[PDB]
């Protein structure tokens, strides 16, 4: 019973069959439907910014090309991941993976550590709990109520307050993906 999971994302069904077959032959992983606390490797069939890619970066997983599985099968063992990192599409991926690997104790990002508390709309996309998870894992502070926050993320129907930034979910996601706190001005609702 492996203690790490691997997740497939943007994976055509015929490629999923191959990954499942390779993991059955090389062992070393359980396959999980979505990124979770045990996940170390996220395999993408097409470099689309899915929720699993985002969660993968937030947790400092390997975010890898499908070709990693193909080469590993050919050589009869799991090979080095570095050559297969999807850094062109997701520049933060190798950055967060490097820092996670250096961590003593559970890893937590610091991208958002200098931001004030954020309230995430219950109506957000990606869904509220996952978007909060992303904010927390990337070193941000999550408010339970809007009065607690200087930043409110996603659809919000309450009365607006003057010293609060009302930003799209994309502000969070583009920041995570680039490992830069994006300029709020471009994400205003």
């Amino acid at each position: 019973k492996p203690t790490r999971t691997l997740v497939m994302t943007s994976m055509p069904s015929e490629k999923q069959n191959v990954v499942i077959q390779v993991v059955d032959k090389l062992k070393g992983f359980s396959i999980a439907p979505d990124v979770c606390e045990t996940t170390t490797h996220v395999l993408s069939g097409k470099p689309l910014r899915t929720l699993n890619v985002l969660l993968g970066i937030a947790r400092g997983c390997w975010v890898l090309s499908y070709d990693w599985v193909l080469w590993s099968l050919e050589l009869g063992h799991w090979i080095s991941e570095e050559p297969f990192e999807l850094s062109h599409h997701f520049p933060a991926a190798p950055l967060c993976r490097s820092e996670c690997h250096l961590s003593a104790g559970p890893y937590r990002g610091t991208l958002f550590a200098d931001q004030p508390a954020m309230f995430v709309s219950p109506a957000s996309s990606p869904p509220v709990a996952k978007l909060c998870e992303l904010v927390h894992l990337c070193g941000g502070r999550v408010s339970q109520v809007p009065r607690q926050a200087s930043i409110v993320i996603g659809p919000y129907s309450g009365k607006k307050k003057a010293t609060v930034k009302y930003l799209s979910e994309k502000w969070v996601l583009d920041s995570i993906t680039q490992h830069k706190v994006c300029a709020p001005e471009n994400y205003l609702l």
Binding site: L48, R49, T50, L54, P126, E169, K170
Partner: peptide
Amino acid sequence: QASQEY
């Protein structure tokens, strides 16, 4: 069907 791109 595909996982949603964000």
